[model samples]
Target: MDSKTNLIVNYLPQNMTQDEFKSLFGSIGDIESCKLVRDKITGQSLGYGFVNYSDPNDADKAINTLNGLKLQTKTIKVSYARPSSASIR
Candidate 1:
């Protein structure tokens, strides 16, 4: 993998939808897929999501531009999402 999923974007808004999130990342092109990690028990927004793009440049762009941006009363932090292997052990 040219870029591992290990670059995770944390501190995103708990209430943002997939589309809304994509709009924010317009600078990045052609979003491949996105996964929002919500609270297991409460079923509420956890304020963070992972987005993958077909182009690595887009992902890098997202981290550069979208990181530390304030949205909906939240300062979002966009970064490379980490894979499970790294987090596991």
Candidate 2:
């Protein structure tokens, strides 16, 4: 199922973990899921990740409050995830 809670986060610190990432967003609301995007071979963060919640409103709140928050020398960006499908003509 596609959930509207999905979010795209950028400018993340390389050493961040999923639990820590969740904790940050959890401060705003319940976290349905969270991930720190990483390189497959090097295991290093790709400087971005995703955060999700069971409710879209929670995600919206997170986006507004978390955007531009400084974390580990970089201001992280938060936004609703774009739908990947391209079906319109």
* Candidate number with greatest TM-score: 2
- Candidate 1's C-alpha runs over 4 A off are 1-7, 38-43, 71-73, 84-89
Model 2: lDDT to the true structure: 0.76
Candidate 2: tens digits of C-alpha lDDT, residues 1-89: 56577877887775565666767777887777777786679677777787778888888888888877886566778878787778879
Candidate 1, residue 64: lDDT: 77
Model 2 spans > 4 angstroms off: 1-3, 84-89
lDDT of 1 by residue, 41-72 (tens): 96676667667777777677777777778766
TM-score of 1: 0.66
TM-scores of all candidate predictions against the true structure: 0.66, 0.74
Residue 30, candidate 2: alpha-carbon lDDT: 76
52 Cα displacement, candidate 1 (Å): 0.4
